[PDB]
């Protein structure tokens with residue numbers, strides 16, 4: 188057997204809740220699982236992706252374990268993909284949870300590759316703080332102002348800094364354009 | 380706008396957890412909701428609960444129409460956008476009309492309940508709800524016997540499977556019930572309403 | 587193994603295209619399938635046709651049990667793993683037991699059909715099928731009026747909305763039928779089975 | 794409004810058929826659409842030409858929906874194009890392979906998953922065991938094409954089949970984690 192399930196979406200979408208839901212199902216059938224977290228739900232804390240494999244090799248590991256949970260994958264590096272693929276190759280079901288976007292609206296750490304490797308994708312939505320539509324993005328605010336493109340990706344926090352928004356209501360001051368004709372197109376279309 | 384979302388599946392699937400998850404989302408955007416529950420026993424219950432941690436307030440109601448009465452009453456918050464209805468299986472067919480009407484009048488209605496009774500047949504009014512729901516989420520549990528995705532609730536009294544003709548309604552948890560796949564759902568004395576069905580099962584046991 | 591997949595939605599949603607798509611997949615792995623169709627729908631004769639891609643042959647059958655008879659007959663290829671059934675809404679309740687039995691005996695059964703009749707009510711036996719289906723795909727069309735996701739089929743005779751009491755079965759296409767959202771589905775003389783429904787609709791029209 | 798829908802999966806999964814089905818729906822409501830395709834529908838040499846075409850006189854102003862088929866052959870510039878399209882009121886429906894023969898992200902598609910509002914990952918049927926197939930497998934003379942072979946190679950059943958995870962095998966697959974091969978050994982022990 189063996190496969191990867193990916194639970195994702197912006198902040199305030201209930202990712203962790205959904206992970207917990209899926210894990211709680213296993214208990215009624217007495218199926219053992221183990222959850223990892225990068226350095227509340229109960230979980231082994233870990234410094235880097237490879238340490239997961241070492242822990243499973245260690246004496247701490249219960250041999251009956253069928254399922255491996257990984258929460259907040261966005262804080263790992265690319266090494267997590269190979270770890271998750273290998274675990275799935277060797278009969279483990281791996282359920283993974285994390286943000287798909289950083290505050291810029293860009294792929295958060297290694298998650299982009301994870302979508303490719305996941306057998307099952309669940310992209311959850313939050314509710315837009317501005318208009319109430321389905322929210323796909325996390326927005327960061329610093330004293331009421333939309334955070335700048337060049338600010339730090341990693342910044343731990345809650346509603347003090349962050350809200351969930353739709354596409355339309357996600358704005359990043361000073362976002363660059365990689366395609367020469369992009370700004371031209373936006374101009375062209377503001378003409379109506 | 381206005382629509383119906385249906386969360387369903389067997390027992391031990393996390394239906395209530397999923398309902399709570401969707402309603403919790405609304406709070407971070409300050410969007411108001413109201414949850415209803417059919418009155419099952421004598422206990423007054425005022426929260427639905429997910430073992431995920433969260434609990435949300437619920438109004439108890441003795442029939443589907445009372446939901447509309449409550450929304451017309453003074454207790455109703457005008458800002459309410461979303462109506463949650465848990466354990467719909469215990470309502471009668473009147474719940475469909477209620478839910479449709481709510482959706483027609485701009486409410487988002489999120490509905491949770493069992494699709495099957497212990498016989499593996501449509502539980503109360505839920506069959507029609509599938510039709511009316513804009514969005515269907517059929518969750519699974521884990522089969523107690525083989526670990527496959529479970530689609531069925533199985534009832535056992537003193538270790539023996541429930542007979543087909545037992546009472547549909549019987550409140551309880553793992554002392555009576557488990558979740559199972561199709562293959563591991565067996566109901567002693569299951570009828571066949573097709574004259575050729577038994578014949579076909581015979582024919583196929585031959586190989 | 588064995589399971590039921592249900593493809594559903596209003597008219598103009600691409601249900602038959604999606605059924606065909608799933609069966610086409612099986613051919614690249616050389617997995618055999620067999621497709622059934624009720625007789626009343628005279629739009630395609632002994633084949634299943636999307637207004638696209640291609641079409642593929644199907645056996646015509648008047649009632650559900652005939653499906654099992656055919657599988658027991660000499661005409662049946664023993665290699666067949668998958669049974670497709672299109673336009674289920676025209677069968678009666680016996681189709682559910684047939685589909686359950688097929689899944690119990692190792693067949694994958696892929697089923698397509700309308701969830702609503704023109705009244706916006708459960709079409710024939712489909713309501714129970716939602717319960718028995720392991721997997722549900724409710725597809726949408728595009729609303730003829732507003733371009734929203736369409737969930738309903740609207741029937742019109744000479745531009746006039748069909749009355750609630752008209753005949754359920756009426757074969758045809760865009761001459762009679764369109765796809766609409768909830769808000770744009772209107773049926774003259776729709777009854778209310780709940781004593782407080784019309785009261786609620788009045789109360790809410792007040793704002 | 795504006796959003797991205799992404800249809801993906803291995804070869805033989807019906808991706809194009811599903812794209813076509815979604816496009817057909819629009820015709821019954823008279824909603825106009827336009828489809829693009831890369832130079833291996835309007836044919837195009839690179840992602841930005843899409844935007845240029847929409848700016849040109851060839852473009853019908855009533856167009857609400859933009860279809861993009863086999864995105865895997867575009868470069869990363871396609872993401873920015875698709876995002877920009879969605880920000881300016883277009884519904885963009887995108888179809889392509891998620892994996893190259895290696896079982897690794899095909900061209901730009903990995904970013905697309907992140908940007909798509911809606912993801913539909915289709916499966917094919919494993920040519921080997923009949924399970925859900927998630928991978929495209931390449932064989933020449935019945936041999937599993939080596940990890941180091943060319944990514945781009947046009948063709949059909951002559952070279953390619955659809956397989957589940959277990960039946961996807963790449964000779965000489967590297968391991969970027971120092972403890973990987975160790976772990977695979979450890980578990981071979983049972």
Ligand SMILES: Cc1cn([C@H]2C[C@H](O)[C@@H](COP(=O)(O)OP(=O)(O)OP(=O)(O)O)O2)c(=O)[nH]c1=O
Nearest residue numbers: 198199200201202203289290325341342343344
């Ligand atoms: C968007 C963003 C979030 N973060 C941080 C802030 C939070 O501490 C953390 C988000 O944790 P999450 O669990 O993803 O946030 P959440 O609890 O609202 O989501 P859920 O309920 O669905 O589980 O990541 C960054 O560091 N940088 C960023 O750009």
Ligand SMILES: Cc1cn([C@H]2C[C@H](O)[C@@H](COP(=O)(O)OP(=O)(O)OP(=O)(O)O)O2)c(=O)[nH]c1=O
Nearest residue numbers: 390391392393394395496497532548549550551
């Ligand atoms: C299957 C079945 C259940 N019941 C009762 C037993 C329980 O009291 C109730 C089931 O409640 P549920 O909330 O569906 O059970 P659950 O908490 O395990 O489900 P979930 O986690 O997915 O939310 O219905 C019957 O009365 N008759 C039946 O045939």
Ligand SMILES: Cc1cn([C@H]2C[C@H](O)[C@@H](COP(=O)(O)OP(=O)(O)OP(=O)(O)O)O2)c(=O)[nH]c1=O
Nearest residue numbers: 597598599600601602703704739754755756758
């Ligand atoms: C709504 C309705 C339809 N019909 C008939 C009209 C058509 O013959 C048939 C609908 O068949 P469908 O195949 O469901 O219509 P369609 O071809 O547009 O479906 P799709 O594109 O999604 O594959 O049902 C009734 O007899 N009574 C009704 O109330």
Ligand SMILES: Cc1cn([C@H]2C[C@H](O)[C@@H](COP(=O)(O)OP(=O)(O)OP(=O)(O)O)O2)c(=O)[nH]c1=O
Nearest residue numbers: 804805806807808809893894929945946947948
């Ligand atoms: C896996 C793989 C495919 N290809 C090529 C071979 C094919 O010509 C093309 C894939 O065919 P497609 O037409 O993109 O997909 P498909 O038609 O087989 O399946 P569907 O019906 O779902 O649309 O891409 C590569 O060039 N490199 C690769 O690594």
Ligand SMILES: [Mg+2]
Nearest residue numbers: 394395396466
């Ligand atoms: Mg519950």
Ligand SMILES: [Mg+2]
Nearest residue numbers: 600601602603
């Ligand atoms: Mg059809």
Ligand SMILES: [Zn+2]
Nearest residue numbers: 315318353356
């Ligand atoms: Zn918004």
Ligand SMILES: [Zn+2]
Nearest residue numbers: 522525560563
């Ligand atoms: Zn089982």
Ligand SMILES: [Zn+2]
Nearest residue numbers: 729732767770
């Ligand atoms: Zn409409």
Ligand SMILES: [Zn+2]
Nearest residue numbers: 919922957960
């Ligand atoms: Zn396989």
